[PDB]
Amino acid sequence: DTTQQLSLLKHVLSEDKRPIAFIIAAGCPVSIRHNDAPLIPDVAGLTRKISDSFGGNPDSLLMKIIQNLKTTIPNPTIEDILSYIRLLQQIPMSGKIHDVENSVINALEESICELIEEEVNVDLPGNATPYHKIAAWINSINREHQVEIFTTNYDLLMEQALEELNVPYFDGFVGSKRAFFDIRTIEENKLPSRWSKLWKLHGSINWQLDKQTQTIWRGTPSKGCSLIHPSHLKYDKMPYLVMMDQLKLFLNQPSAILITCGYSYKDQHINEVLSQGLQTNPNALIYGLQYDVLENYQEAKDMALKRSNLILLAKDRAIIGKKEGEWKPDPQSSQDNDPLLFFKLGDFQHLASFLEEISQ
Amino acid sequence: DTTQQLSLLKHVLSEDKRPIAFIIAAGCPVSIRHNDAPLIPDVAGLTRKISDSFGGNPDSLLMKIIQNLKTTIPNPTIEDILSYIRLLQQIPMSGKIHDVENSVINALEESICELIEEEVNVDLPGNATPYHKIAAWINSINREHQVEIFTTNYDLLMEQALEELNVPYFDGFVGSKRAFFDIRTIEENKLPSRWSKLWKLHGSINWQLDKQTQTIWRGTPSKGCSLIHPSHLKYDKMPYLVMMDQLKLFLNQPSAILITCGYSYKDQHINEVLSQGLQTNPNALIYGLQYDVLENYQEAKDMALKRSNLILLAKDRAIIGKKEGEWKPDPQSSQDNDPLLFFKLGDFQHLASFLEEISQ
Amino acid sequence: DTTQQLSLLKHVLSEDKRPIAFIIAAGCPVSIRHNDAPLIPDVAGLTRKISDSFGGNPDSLLMKIIQNLKTTIPNPTIEDILSYIRLLQQIPMSGKIHDVENSVINALEESICELIEEEVNVDLPGNATPYHKIAAWINSINREHQVEIFTTNYDLLMEQALEELNVPYFDGFVGSKRAFFDIRTIEENKLPSRWSKLWKLHGSINWQLDKQTQTIWRGTPSKGCSLIHPSHLKYDKMPYLVMMDQLKLFLNQPSAILITCGYSYKDQHINEVLSQGLQTNPNALIYGLQYDVLENYQEAKDMALKRSNLILLAKDRAIIGKKEGEWKPDPQSSQDNDPLLFFKLGDFQHLASFLEEISQ
């Protein structure tokens, strides 16, 4: 199954007549090796580090909230904790749910945001990182269709990699000193065809909000960025709907393609927008790739079984057009002991090698 | 003479079929009143403040250099002083010219740059400033030709005014974290027709240089900007030639227009590029306006008498097509005492009022 | 490797639908044999003969300047010496750097000018010189695209060769008595398609300057030509920017070609303009050829490794599209002793033989 899918991917990517996109999740930042440690400890790390940072003391309100969510949510996460805290702040919650903190919940969320900001505020080391290889592939060949990138992460790795290799891009904001969120140019969609486009669905660490005019602007990361929101904020002083609209509008073009790397399909809104756009445009494709074993992804299998133009691929088996297939007999592992048929090419580093090979 | 020039300027500006530009000099920042004091004391102020800052002591090197320049330059200028200092730094000047400072000339220029940064690093107060009126005029009516702005100033007033009123623009750099100087898109010249363009010929306070790769990028104003240069730097790690080329290339459009506000035509390179472009394209026009009396500008008179399509205007008289005319008899001043015929409409505040009147 | 590259060069040159250019450096004038001595002693000669002309006396200013430059420049050259002297002249250098020469620096640079002028003021002997063969090739076949020549030299050999074989050309100046530098026609670019174009980037020996109007004109070589400047002169009374711009503008034509003969890529500005134009237009090609061994050219190897459309060729190895290859096994030398694989065609005389063979 390796040769056929590899060749098909090569042919589909080599053509310059089709739109291309990416979705970048925590797998991409974690795939970078540093001091034999993860560069960013992903969502699970960002949860356990907060849990240990406030300690195991039951007097801590954050532990109380975590165990409260354990009753309803089997595996609560930082996104759920943040949304829960924001809801609790949204109404005058002076009751027993907030009996521990009459007003210290604001301090708790402030500390959580500051610690996340400090943890994800790093930079790309060297020039051998996979992001540099991806940008090299992007600017290697001029194509009549722009290459877009959708990011669910908070780090600025992709921007830095695109800047170092001198690839222009437009991320929504226009300006120099404290750039505003320009709306009209987003829907005009008449930027130079040579530009890329980098949409940040989940926000970023440098987005900030000024309450005096209740307007957002991207500047430099200061202490406490108020648009860290994992898609949980006010109504449309909010760019989230616009970025989702852009994803949808992209999906509806003819012969559209998309690739997800590091995505686990554990977000409801992303999943339903992908499904709805994939239904409205039968020509749309999603070549989802999972580095983990497929058995951990029931949501991905469900989505793949509900639609025929979603070539979901995994480490062990594959789902090609509502039919599930496993790895055919090939000498993937030379060693006789444990002859596991694993798709080692689904990891981000291997993907970057693949793109570099295509480009050269 | 008031009605004819006012009406014809109204007609030429009201049309949307012609390119328009501006040149913005120190007259525009000084025209702002603050505490009954100038917001920025202009080049003369930025010279006297440095002169008094090091005191009257003749043992100091800066006043030594100033009096050295007095022998050759009748009225030395901070531009000339900076160029002279940089030039002295270019070669191992251990001689009597630099006998006072074997190596302290670097500290002297560092202090000059730091004080310039501190003094020109301010912001627009309120929403009644003329820059806001200009931006309101720019975005008031959509025009098929983009409106450019060339400025030789160091302050970021124009950027702030344009982005507060939601006006997109492109100043050469493309990016988010540390935007690089993108070159190709500058000469492609296929940006969206709705965008303005803001070119900074003399550099800015936020431009910075990384000597590790000898590449420039625009970031945030930090401790000492290495692109403070009033057009005196290295060869083509330097964007000055590109912005000059952009002015020239603009001048060659058919039916092109240009307006200079606060410019005294005291810079030779700008003057020669204006003259050469005006000669190559007879359709080009320059409606240069001077706030001061005409007698103070010999260079402007020379250029106006040299070319036929340079409709130069002043406070007292005017030069329209190589012929000089004075103010016709009109009741400009109601008072019998001192019936001075002065074109008070040439001031920047009055100009902003005129633009607002045209827009409404 | 000989046959394939020779055939490919024959095919690319034989086509008449592509622009062609040349770059001529000191290798071409030195390749002429005269009295078993070099016709022009190249930059090394123009340095060492000046050094010996003023003698080894340490009291001389020129020897002091050379030893001063040795501290910063490991191998100072006549270009560097001239630039340093002009730079010292630019400011009232009455200090210890010029203590020996209160005003003798002007005399030193003068004497240098007349000496180099006398040394490079010669003529083509006979009709068997390679320049005659090149001109014969140029006018042998009518081509729809003009053949340009860029010269970094000061000699008038190429003009004489083109005149003798009746080949028209335009070198920028238009006129008969004191031909002025016409600017408009340069950028109109509507000369007759049969004309060649000869651009002099580094100036030439017959250019002169009149200080009364501060305008340049080409006349006859008189006592002291004020435009021998190797690209170190005043701002845009200076045609250097125009000729460099012409090189750049040429590089942007589709399917453009270029050949450098005798160039060592030792000039920063030419190198960066070549790199930038080669980057902007991937269709641009540079078939740089070196008569010397490639191991002496780190700059050329760097440039070739940074771009993919620069088929750099040398005497021993070759760099074809960012990949380095060496000479394949062939009986290049019949003698068993020292079977060195050397590309004898890289010398100018052999190149002229190749061109005339192609033409016939």
**Residues 6 or more apart from B276 whose CB is under 8 A from it?**
B248, C183
Phi, psi of C191 (to 5 degrees): -70, 160
Q: Are C249 and B245 in contact (CB under 8 A)?
A: no
The pair of three-digit structure tokens given for residue B359, joined into one six-digit string: 């827009």
Whether B56 has its CB under 8 Å from any CB of chain C: the answer is no
Cβ neighbours of C124 (radius 10 Å): 20
Sheet holding A317-320, edge to edge: A311-313, A317-320, A324-326
Q: Are A216 and A179 in contact (CB under 8 A)?
A: no
- Nearest CA-CA partner of C160 in C190, C129, C185, C189: C129
Whether A184 has its CB under 8 Å from any CB of chain B: the answer is yes
Contact between chains at C97 and B93 (C-beta distance less than 8 A) = yes
Cβ neighbours of B259 (radius 10 Å): 18
Residues 159-178 of B with CB under 8 A from C: none
Q: Are B232 and B251 in contact (CB under 8 A)?
A: no
Whether C188 has its CB under 8 Å from any CB of chain B: the answer is no
Cβ neighbours of C268 (radius 10 Å): 12
- Nearest CA-CA partner of A277 in A8, A80, A23, A26: A23
Cβ neighbours of B206 (radius 10 Å): 22
User: Which residues in A303-318 are b (16+ Cβ under 10 Å) and which e?
Assistant: bbeebeebbbbbbebb
Q: How far is CA A182 from CA A28, A241, B171, in A?
A: 29, 14, 16
Whether A354 has its CB under 8 Å from any CB of chain B: the answer is no
**SS3 state at A307:** coil
The pair of three-digit structure tokens given for residue C65, joined into one six-digit string: 């300047």
Cβ neighbours of C314 (radius 10 Å): 26
Q: How many angstroms separate the CA atoms of A32 and C290, rounded? A: 43
Phi, psi of C168 (to 5 degrees): -70, 150
Mutate to test the interface with C, among B65, B72, B73, B93 (most CBs of C within 10 A): B93
Q: How many angstroms separate the CA atoms of C296 and C302, rounded? A: 12
Contact between chains at A182 and B160 (C-beta distance less than 8 A) = no
Place of tokens 């505040």: B349
Q: Among B185, B194, B206, select the one facing A192 at the smallest CB separation.
A: B185
Q: How many angstroms separate the CA atoms of B197 and B190, rounded? A: 12
Classify residue A167 as exposed, middle or buried by CB count within 10 Å of its CB (0-12, 13-18, 19+). buried
- Nearest CA-CA partner of A85 in A60, A70, A107, A52: A107
> Which segments of chain C are extended strands (E)?
23-24, 33-34, 37-38, 148-151, 169-170, 173-174, 179-181, 196-200, 207-210, 215-218, 260-261, 311-313, 317-320, 324-326
Strand-pair category, A173-174 with A207-210: unpaired
Q: Which residues pair with A228 in a beta bridge?
A: none
Classify residue C94 as exposed, middle or buried by CB count within 10 Å of its CB (0-12, 13-18, 19+). middle
- DSSP letter assigned to residue A146: P
Phi, psi of C108 (to 5 degrees): -65, -50
**SS3 state at C225:** coil
Q: Which helix (H) or strand (E) holds B215?
A: strand B215-218
Q: Which helix (H) or strand (E) holds A174?
A: strand A173-174
**SS3 state at C321:** coil
Q: Are C201 and C247 in contact (CB under 8 A)?
A: yes
- Nearest CA-CA partner of A252 in A228, A273, A224: A273
Resolution for this model in angstroms, one decimal place? 4.4
Mutate to test the interface with B, among C90, C236, C270 (most CBs of B within 10 A): C236
**SS3 state at A224:** coil
**SS3 state at A93:** coil
Q: Are C2 and C346 in contact (CB under 8 A)?
A: no
Q: How far is CA B32 from CA A114, B125, C134, in A?
A: 40, 10, 66
Chain B residue at shortest CA distance from C270: B236
Residue C212 C-alpha, separation from nearest chain B C-alpha, in angstroms: 18
Classify residue A334 as exposed, middle or buried by CB count within 10 Å of its CB (0-12, 13-18, 19+). exposed
Chains with 3+ CB–CB pairs under 8 A to C are B
- Nearest CA-CA partner of C51 in C73, C38, C66, C30: C66
Q: Among B91, B98, B268, select the one facing C87 at the smallest CB separation.
A: B91
From the CA atom positions of chain A, what is the Rg in Å?
22
Task: Give the CA count within 13 Å in the CB-facing half-sphere of B121.
Answer: 16
> Which segments of C176-323 are extended strands (E)?
179-181, 196-200, 207-210, 215-218, 260-261, 311-313, 317-320
Chain B residues in contact with C98 (beta carbon < 8 A): 95
Q: How many angstroms separate the CA atoms of B264 and B246, rounded? A: 21
Q: Which helix (H) or strand (E) holds A88?
A: helix A78-90
The pair of three-digit structure tokens given for residue A141, joined into one six-digit string: 């060949």
Whether A186 has its CB under 8 Å from any CB of chain B: the answer is no
Contact between chains at B95 and C95 (C-beta distance less than 8 A) = yes
Q: Which helix (H) or strand (E) holds B208?
A: strand B207-210
The pair of three-digit structure tokens given for residue A191, joined into one six-digit string: 């930027």
Q: How far is CA C297 from CA C94, C279, C304, C313, in A?
A: 40, 21, 11, 11
Q: How many angstroms separate the CA atoms of C160 and C166, rounded? A: 10
Chain B residues in contact with C269 (beta carbon < 8 A): 235-236
Whether B103 has its CB under 8 Å from any CB of chain C: the answer is no
Q: Would the CA dihedral through B218, B223, B229, B235 be positive or negative?
A: negative
Place of tokens 């970031």: B219
Q: Which residues pair with C313 in a beta bridge?
A: C289, C318
The full DSSP string for C139-195 is HHS--SSPBEEEE-----HHHHHHHHTT--EE-SEE-SSSEEE--HHHHH----TT-
Helix then strand then coil, % of chain B, to nearest 5:
40, 10, 45
Q: How many angstroms separate the CA atoms of A283 and A258, rounded? A: 11
Q: How many angstroms separate the CA atoms of C1 and C4, rounded? A: 6
**Residues 6 or more apart from C83 whose CB is under 8 A from it?**
C230, C232
Q: How many angstroms separate the CA atoms of C251 and C230, rounded? A: 22
**SS3 state at A287:** coil
Q: How many angstroms separate the CA atoms of C37 and C45, rounded? A: 12
Place of tokens 């010929």: B201
Q: Would the CA dihedral through C113, C116, C119, C123 be positive or negative?
A: negative
Whether C242 has its CB under 8 Å from any CB of chain B: the answer is no
- Nearest CA-CA partner of C40 in C205, C166, C197: C205
Mutate to test the interface with B, among A121, A160, A173, A177 (most CBs of B within 10 A): A177
Q: Which residues pair with B24 in a beta bridge?
A: B151, B261
Contact between chains at A159 and B177 (C-beta distance less than 8 A) = yes
Q: Are B139 and B167 in contact (CB under 8 A)?
A: yes
User: Which residues in B36-47 are b (16+ Cβ under 10 Å) and which e?
Assistant: eeebbbbbeebb
Q: Among A184, A188, A220, select the one facing B220 at the smallest CB separation.
A: A220
Q: Would the CA dihedral through A347, A352, A353, A355 be positive or negative?
A: positive
Classify residue A126 as exposed, middle or buried by CB count within 10 Å of its CB (0-12, 13-18, 19+). exposed
**SS3 state at B22:** strand
Q: Are A293 and A301 in contact (CB under 8 A)?
A: no
Q: Are B78 and B50 in contact (CB under 8 A)?
A: yes
Residues 109-128 of B with CB under 8 A from C: none
Contact between chains at B269 and C84 (C-beta distance less than 8 A) = no
For chain B, what's the residue count? Answer: 360
Q: Are A259 and A21 in contact (CB under 8 A)?
A: yes
Q: How many angstroms separate the CA atoms of C81 and A58, rounded? A: 79
- Nearest CA-CA partner of C215 in C199, C197, C238: C238
The pair of three-digit structure tokens given for residue B77, joined into one six-digit string: 């200028």
Q: How many angstroms separate the CA atoms of C147 and C143, rounded? A: 8
Contact between chains at B177 and A194 (C-beta distance less than 8 A) = no
Q: Among C94, C269, C280, select the one facing B97 at the smallest CB separation.
A: C94
Q: Among C88, C269, C280, select the one facing B91 at the smallest CB separation.
A: C88
Q: Among B175, B192, B220, select the one facing A163 at the smallest CB separation.
A: B175
Chain B residues in contact with A124 (beta carbon < 8 A): none
Q: Which residues pair with C23 in a beta bridge?
A: C150, C260
Place of tokens 């409801």: A268
Q: Are C289 and C256 in contact (CB under 8 A)?
A: no
Contact between chains at B175 and A156 (C-beta distance less than 8 A) = no
- DSSP letter assigned to residue A217: E
**Residues 6 or more apart from B198 whose CB is under 8 A from it?**
A176, B148, B149, B151, B158, B159, B162, B169, B170, B171
Q: Which helix (H) or strand (E) holds A80?
A: helix A78-90
Q: How far is CA C184 from CA B207, C188, C190, in A?
A: 35, 6, 11
Taking each helix axis from N to C end, the angle separating C42-53 and C78-90, rounded to the nearest 10 degrees, works out to 60
Whether A11 has its CB under 8 Å from any CB of chain B: the answer is no
Q: How many angstroms separate the CA atoms of C99 and C320, rounded? A: 53
Q: How many angstroms separate the CA atoms of B1 and B352, rounded? A: 20
Largest CA distance in chain B: 68
CA angle at C328 for the pair C325 and C331, rounded to the nearest 5°: 150
Chain B residue at shortest CA distance from A205: B177
The pair of three-digit structure tokens given for residue C235, joined into one six-digit string: 């701002």
Q: Would the CA dihedral through B86, B88, B94, B98 be positive or negative?
A: negative
Residue C267 C-alpha, separation from nearest chain B C-alpha, in angstroms: 12
Helices and strands, number each (H, E), in chain A? 13, 14
Place of tokens 């080409």: C218
Place of tokens 């694989």: C341
Place of tokens 């690089």: B180
CA angle at A93 for the pair A89 and A95, rounded to the nearest 5°: 150
The pair of three-digit structure tokens given for residue B315, joined into one six-digit string: 């406070």
Residue A264 C-alpha, separation from nearest chain B C-alpha, in angstroms: 28
Residue B335 C-alpha, separation from nearest chain C C-alpha, in angstroms: 49
The full DSSP string for B78-142 is HHHHHHHHHHHHTTT--SGGGSS-SSTHHHHHHHHHHHHHHHH-----SS-SHHHHHHHHHHHS-
Residue B148 C-alpha, separation from nearest chain A C-alpha, in angstroms: 15
